[PDB]
Symmetry: C3
Subunit: 591 residues, 3 copies
Amino acid sequence: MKKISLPKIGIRPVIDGRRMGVRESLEEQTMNMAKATAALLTEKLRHACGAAVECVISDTCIAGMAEAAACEEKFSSQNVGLTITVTPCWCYGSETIDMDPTRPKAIWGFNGTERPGAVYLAAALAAHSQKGIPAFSIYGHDVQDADDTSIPADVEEKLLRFARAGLAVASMKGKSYLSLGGVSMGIAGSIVDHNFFESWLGMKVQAVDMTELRRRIDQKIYDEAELEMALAWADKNFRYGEDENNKQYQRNAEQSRAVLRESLLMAMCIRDMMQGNSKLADIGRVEESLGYNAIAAGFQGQRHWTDQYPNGDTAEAILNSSFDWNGVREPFVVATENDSLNGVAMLMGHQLTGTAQVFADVRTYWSPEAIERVTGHKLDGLAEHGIIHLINSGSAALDGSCKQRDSEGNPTMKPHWEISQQEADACLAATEWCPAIHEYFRGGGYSSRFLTEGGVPFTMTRVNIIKGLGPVLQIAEGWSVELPKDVHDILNKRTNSTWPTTWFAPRLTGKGPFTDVYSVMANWGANHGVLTIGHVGADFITLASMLRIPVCMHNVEETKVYRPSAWAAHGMDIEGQDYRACQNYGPLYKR
Amino acid sequence: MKKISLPKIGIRPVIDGRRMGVRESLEEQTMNMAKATAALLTEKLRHACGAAVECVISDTCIAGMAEAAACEEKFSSQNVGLTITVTPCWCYGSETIDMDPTRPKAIWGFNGTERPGAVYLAAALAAHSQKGIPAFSIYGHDVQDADDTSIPADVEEKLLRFARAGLAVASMKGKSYLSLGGVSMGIAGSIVDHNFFESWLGMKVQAVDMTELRRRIDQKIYDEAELEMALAWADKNFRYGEDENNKQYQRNAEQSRAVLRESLLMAMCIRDMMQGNSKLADIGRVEESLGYNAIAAGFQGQRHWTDQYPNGDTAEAILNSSFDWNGVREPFVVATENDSLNGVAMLMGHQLTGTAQVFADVRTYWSPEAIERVTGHKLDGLAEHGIIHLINSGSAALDGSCKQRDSEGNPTMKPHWEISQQEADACLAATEWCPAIHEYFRGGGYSSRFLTEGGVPFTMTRVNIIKGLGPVLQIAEGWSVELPKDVHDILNKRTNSTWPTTWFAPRLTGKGPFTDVYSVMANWGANHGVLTIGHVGADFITLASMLRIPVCMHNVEETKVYRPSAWAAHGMDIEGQDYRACQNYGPLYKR
Amino acid sequence: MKKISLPKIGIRPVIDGRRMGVRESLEEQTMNMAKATAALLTEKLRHACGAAVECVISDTCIAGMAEAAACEEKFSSQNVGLTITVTPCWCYGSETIDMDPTRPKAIWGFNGTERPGAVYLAAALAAHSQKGIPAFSIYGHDVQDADDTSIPADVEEKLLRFARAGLAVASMKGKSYLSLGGVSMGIAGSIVDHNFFESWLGMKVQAVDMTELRRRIDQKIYDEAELEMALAWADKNFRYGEDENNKQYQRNAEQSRAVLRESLLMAMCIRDMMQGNSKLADIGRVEESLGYNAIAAGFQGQRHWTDQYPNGDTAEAILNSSFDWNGVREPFVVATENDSLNGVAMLMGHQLTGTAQVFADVRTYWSPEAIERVTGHKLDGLAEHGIIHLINSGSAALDGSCKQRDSEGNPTMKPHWEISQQEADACLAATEWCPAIHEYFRGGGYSSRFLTEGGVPFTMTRVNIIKGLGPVLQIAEGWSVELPKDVHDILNKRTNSTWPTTWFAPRLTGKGPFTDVYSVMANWGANHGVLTIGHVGADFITLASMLRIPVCMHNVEETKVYRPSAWAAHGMDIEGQDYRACQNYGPLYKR
Ligand SMILES: C[C@H](O)[C@@H](O)[C@@H](O)[C@H](O)CO
Ligand SMILES: C[C@H](O)[C@@H](O)[C@@H](O)[C@H](O)CO
Ligand SMILES: C[C@H](O)[C@@H](O)[C@@H](O)[C@H](O)CO
Ligand SMILES: [Mn+2]
Ligand SMILES: [Mn+2]
Ligand SMILES: [Mn+2]
């Protein structure tokens, strides 16, 4: 009922089992290590929903099987989703490691001399790899004194990266993906793969035909009082763009209201379907009040719904935003055109950062030659080598305007718990609602148009399913760029002026698909992509290794790739070790 | 007889299915794109046999399954062996793609803004990869205006490279490889693998014992009128070399004329076996008149035939040349020593270029130190880093002399439809026929000795079968070099002066087998290679990807490798993605 | 009974089968090649046990299957473990190659022009790869005259590397690994994998509970005379160290003599268990006199034996050394803590070099910042980039002190047949025997403390078993460094002053795990490693390819990797070709 038993982090203090003074002289330091680790995690980490992260420590230090078993008994009743084993000394490898085959696991060995914790680390990892249960290694660079209790910056970074990814894995487990509708215009990702969700992500799929949304609307299976409040909020805050439809299709005020009204109801009903709504019990809809336990959803839309009813532009834009008529909240994950694979990339991004995700059509690659030819401007700066036009077909999280600001005053996208109502209103003020183009969307609709501020670091990702290989992940870190007004207008009126725009410039590496901007575009595996704030490729890489999804393309620095130590046994090559290891271990949950 | 149905190219114009003016406004531009594609292909391409290429266009634009089905019906009765789907707009991915699992497929999406054809391209490719039916991508670099009907250079290159390789694939399908004889001196490639031909190339294998050649000659199963003509031509044109059998094993008793007569008969009979000959019906040999429908053949020769009858040097040299007593014609593909794997490399080279192929023994690697020691000259130019001696054991297509000339006057090898009678005669004049060395070829024979002109770009290739892996392809682009007269003679007399020579220098890259000339030699997987005119490694790489044969070695620029888009999902590494993708998809026809 | 039929090298002179002059003119040169090869091998190689290597040559030259069969019959009764086929001419590929699927095979083709041996080489190799029985290629760089009988330096290097590795393979076949005890402190390598030994190495595993060692000691199942001699030798040569034990635990006089006496007995009994001892048969203990035919062993020790009896430090240090009370001898291979995987690395190293192997705990990585912080000295030279502290928990071959000297007077470790009594005594004089720390080793013991001289080239290796992948090899060439007297003391006192130390600096490459010293440590797959004298990575790589064990990490120059030619067919990439080939061929003996 909200806070539906969030996963916890289990900390396992391991120790030398022998006495005669040995174990007893190490007891305090070992538990301190465990307490220090828990303190750091609960302080620096938050679930994507906003809640604080809880850690569970073993009742005693673990020196053998009896103690390990006791710890396991404690953890399994506490819903721990990942573990971190810590130690400042030598311990008995296989008798003390966490044997659970599915939960993400890490081992931190104190780097000391009188305290040879790193020696255990190496021995424990060897046992993990020999037994087919990969684990992450956390080894600090510089030697620490036996009395030093601080956690080095390099160790802290790895602990946080491991836990952040680990939590993402644990949070998806058991949740549903709501497929509202089916295949949208033959888009591969909208042919929802039930097995992928179940085997790789540990999720379930709930399929619902779109006539169900029509039923909730027509039969008043919604909160009527909330509707009136949503309309008041729209009236007070919505800035409307110009209608670019052919004259015969332009709707008079009354009809335009009917579209706005229905559009807001769509947002309400979809949200209610995803997480349930107790108010529905008040109106005789107890079954419907339960929801589908969905942590992500997709709305087919075209062609069947949109050829007669308002499109999902408004609903998708609002639900994916960090706010609405009820104030700021955690953004939902709703994929347009029911593209579940983009939904998955969005889910991952959200679980890792707690921020709103931008759904985008990778529409055009603008070479510097093409820019010059159509606008006369000889482009420079981040856009010097080409630019990719990212515009979703009508919706995008309003947070995407990048009107929020960080400590230093820079444009950014932040976790909902750091967004002020002022920033929420600013994002709404930077958005214009434009009527949907009638020939494509016969039932009408309202698109969210904004222009993302330039100079913002972004990470573009996409998951694709390749028959005979399985799922693969693509990553491209880059920046949004700002084009001079005149140039932006030429390009914008030539493409789709009523849709949200983000001009993207990927960081080039000079090798492979990152030789130039054209290659990044040419090697993208679908027509959609997801934008997550910042340069979080390293996080996506760690998360993918936990799920055994090969990263077929990325521009992240080799030194920043952090995966279970077993990957290294599969080769020195960052790509080869990945394809070999993933094929070896396979999906986390089955087959 | 001849022109036995050549494969056609199917062009599929795909379009957005919705009306209200949308589809009707895109119809003309879409069909124009199809027509422009057909025009370009029929104009720039020719079948290796010289015939023009025919394209079949769908009767209507394809927007969904009903239309896709109608198109398929039309194509299947027209013998189309490869398709190219073209479009200037968004279309419904899985409802419009070519589902045929075996034919090569490509998609060309117009790179426009009001015309988002590339958006469809990316979506359709994603569906191809999700459904395990890989397709090639044709995406132009620069944005074009909606009214622009020209085909950019970069788009034209990809279209031609795809079509050229796809035609090669479609042309081999259904044809036979004629194994005349069996294993020649334990040479691996002469242990003909029937499964390889059937599963990978879609061909059949016809084995014929060599006693059948003896029968055709002894029982006069050939055109007597034609033999008279061949002899006349030989007498009139053959320049003879000095005999070298220590003034003992020579033919002063006129067995020389008998050998010549038999050698030409071998050429006639082998040819008749390959494609048939209606004249044989006139003399009662109707079964023999049919031929074996062979598109390539191998003649065992040693040891069993050559220990008593004239060797195959003359027949092989003539058959592989672009001319004979009947004028210029398409060269045949006849592998010496029945090395079917070299025959396959030759087949590929011929189907891709329409030119004669040079069969060669990779005989000696000459290091610059070795050259200086034996001749005194410190070599420079292309030969500066070492040189490889390529000499087949007595035969080579006379075109190999490089006496033909291109527009700019450079020495070259051309498709038979561009070879003039003058050029054919010039090639014959550059060749000297030398008597076979008795101790090796007891039945006698005549070798074709010529020296290939220096500075000509060549591509050396070889196909090998690795148990546990399957077939692999090796490519090495380089140039023929010209050695100063004093040097050539020292090396030539020291090796095999009566055999055709080609001094080869491979382009070095500094990495792998291409670190130095010695490594190129050391990593070649057999004692034979095939030389194809020009630097056509890129075409061989595209063709190999269509047949799923891994390229284990090559020196082609990374930017020039063009394969189905699915390959990228298997990795950014050019080699790793190949081995992984080939193992995934497997042979095209079975298992 | 000693000299238990050492494997022999078979030399196969191959030749053109045709008479009438050909074969007869080549007979003498071909056999000379065979004789020259045998002469070189027997002169430059020695079995690790000290014996000279014997070569068996075929009775006649091999030109076909009848002769090949005859040769095989002769070889199989002579215990040949590897073959080298030599030839100066063209021969009949598949009819002449060695078809044995398990023995290491090489082919040396003379690089001449009148003598086209290289042409046969390439053909034979192609047959080997097509038939799934990989073979090594020996092709010289520079062309030789037909009358030249010398073996070039580059050819010599490849012949020796192949033979040395091949002998190692043949020597392990059929021998046992003695597991004295079971798992030691949960260490993965001590959970002995019977299948690994049987399938990959072709060895057997003999398990013996440690109570058996207790029984031999208590029931006097050993040579009483010898013990008297061992004690005399110890009394006269052992230099003792400061007792670091807490005073209440310091044992003195009587007890100390008892610990020494038992420690030496452990060495004797373990040795007797490995190779048998006839003297035991004299005393009526016949079953025990046989031994277990063990070529390598591991002693569990902790926790169960050491919690009550003297530890294995002294036994392990003596047995792994090249000398003891009986003079210099071949060192034994005894793994501490029964770490069989380190035992295997030691076995390989010893079989390849014939020298003593150093067992080590990869204890600490000292970054330059860490060094500076704790000692004040800013470091340069080999130690400039960081250093790795290698210290085994109490024992190490005394040879490890590097008190032996080579021709040039440099510190080194030599094959026992080159070690003089003077050097043996020098190593013992550089060692101090220190009492074991009571809380860890309650039964007592004596550790061998010495400091390895700096500037000596070393090769650190490790074998690990990765579930789902199989065994993998790790290599890291580097040098031991010498730290200034003041710095060494700070670090040594801070760690474990009573244990043998080796400061190691790995050669950096700038790529992968060899970017910096930290990465070398962080990517080591266990807490143990083996040190072999010199830079023998190339030998380890060749040996591994013969056993199909992928090398997951190494810093050897790409030009020095020598593997069967079939590896190249699996790719140009040194790593990718390896994983692909190893997966293809699998273990040498089964499954
Ligand atoms: C309006 C078009 O149908 C639009 O919906 C498509 O371009 C859509 O983005 C497919 O991804
Ligand atoms: C004359 C020799 O037998 C010659 O035929 C061989 O070298 C042949 O080239 C094998 O490839
Ligand atoms: C004394 C310790 O138990 C010591 O034996 C361990 O560090 C051992 O080296 C494990 O590898
Ligand atoms: Mn879209
Ligand atoms: Mn040949
Ligand atoms: Mn140890």
